[PDB]
Amino acid sequence: MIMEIPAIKALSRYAQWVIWKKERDTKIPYNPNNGKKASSTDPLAWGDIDEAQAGLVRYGANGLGFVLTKSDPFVFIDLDHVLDENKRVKCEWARQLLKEIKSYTEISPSGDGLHVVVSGKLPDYIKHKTKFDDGSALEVYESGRYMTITGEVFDGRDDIKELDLSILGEFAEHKILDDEAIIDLMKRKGQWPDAPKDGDDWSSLDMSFANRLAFWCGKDIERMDRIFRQSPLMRQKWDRPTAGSTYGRITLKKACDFVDSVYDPALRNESDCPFEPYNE
Ligand SMILES: Nc1nc2c(ncn2[C@H]2C[C@H](O)[C@@H](COP(=O)(O)OP(=O)(O)OP(=O)(O)O)O2)c(=O)[nH]1
Ligand SMILES: [Mg+2]
Ligand SMILES: [Mg+2]
């Protein structure tokens, strides 16, 4: 019955289909022809819709997916946690977006979200992901991404439409070594902290982790801060004022004065790190 939907017929023109399966709370995309993990950049890792339907039953995956590319005309709008227990919209922002972007809408696989597929072009000044106090989120992509396909047509909106997408500027937020290189380096060296557990002096985990950052970042106080904000030790206390400074900066500066050596990127002195790896 899926191939009856006009929008699914439109997507089946493209050999950009995959299948996905729930690992933990992630949704990994897989090559429908052989079952390997599918890249989002390798077109030969995908298949057409017939191969995705066949591969779905073969490996028992959770459902179909569609990879978005620059040259196809589609735009993927992801609305998370915007539906009731009986699948009506409970967020007023999502209610207004659906009024001004009337195109193919379907219920996402968790039942509490929506997908809208539109032909158009995204504004270049908006963030990919926008999070709201409500707990909902708006995530938009036109390439370098795949979308789960359910066919659960919402509100009978079963047709991809050609719409202007400047209206998204009213919903998404606007937007104007290497940090990730250091993060991966610290992870591989066993120096990336685990999330704090019950009965853990979080403030003491902060300081220990901040000491390591002082080494691996070369006491680059602004880099240590950018990296700390992506760690499982980040919390609202980090930016609370304390004596004409924030708790986060007082921690980072204390670490910079505590640590003696520094990791020189050009010297590879990983053996100079004075802190033992995080046990597992
Ligand atoms: N897990 C995962 N998802 C990806 C990747 N590239 C694109 N995606 C897609 C699959 C998802 O449909 C899309 C949005 O993520 P979501 O958390 O919102 O899952 P989805 O909307 O499909 O269902 P749900 O929100 O839980 O109701 O991101 C990837 O490398 N890993
Ligand atoms: Mg979603
Ligand atoms: Mg596209």
Q: How do the domains of the chain map onto residue ranges?
A: 1-176, 177-280
Q: Which residues contact 176 (CB under 8 A, 6 or more apart)?
A: 125
- Protein residue closest via CA to atom 26 of ligand 1: 110
Which residues on adjacent β-strands are paired with residue 161?
none
Ligand 1 neighbours, Cβ below 6 Å, are: 26-28, 40, 78, 80, 108-110, 113, 139, 145-148
Question: Closest ligand to 14 CA?
Answer: 3
Task: Determine the distance separating the centroid of ligand 3 and the alpha carbon of 78, expressed in angstroms.
Answer: 14
Task: Please report how the helices 202-216 and 247-258 are oriented relative to each other, as an axis angle in degrees rounded to 10.
Answer: 50
Stated resolution in angstroms: 2.4
272 noted as active-site residue:
no
Q: Which residues contact 24 (CB under 8 A, 6 or more apart)?
A: none
> What sign does the dihedral 149-155-161-165 (CA atoms) show?
negative
How were these coordinates obtained?
Answer: X-ray
Which amino acid is located at 54 in the chain? A
